[PDB]
């Protein structure tokens, strides 16, 4: 959580990007990063089961 990048004003929209990784059994591994409008990084999750 890059809180040093949280803006002082609420933006109308925040972007996101999720890259699938692979499936084992009946469980899926993904990854997800939440980004501001102009590319500033907010949250980065490198593994979601």
């Amino acid at each position: 959580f890059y809180s040093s990048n949280v803006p002082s004003t609420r933006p109308q929209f925040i972007y996101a990007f999720a890259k699938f990784d692979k499936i084992v059994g009946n469980s899926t591994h993904g990854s997800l990063d939440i980004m501001l409008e102009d590319g500033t990084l907010l949250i980065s999750i490198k593994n979601v089961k």
């Binding site: 929209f13 972007y15 990007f17 999720a18 890259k19 699938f20 590319g39």
Partner: protein
């Protein structure tokens, strides 16, 4: 992070809200309006 190159990366198609949430309903994930937030979802090759 570079927005433009990721937009080019993940631009196989584009999806409005309703199509995405119906697709999610296919995953047995019903959702009320209060949890309907994704507006436009452009899918890629596993990168969205």
């Amino acid at each position: 992070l570079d927005i433009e190159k990721l937009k080019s990366q993940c631009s196989f198609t584009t999806l409005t809200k309703s199509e995405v949430y119906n697709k999610l309903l296919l995953l047995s994930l019903p959702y009320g309006p209060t949890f309907q937030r994704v507006e436009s979802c452009s899918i890629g090759d596993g990168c969205s």
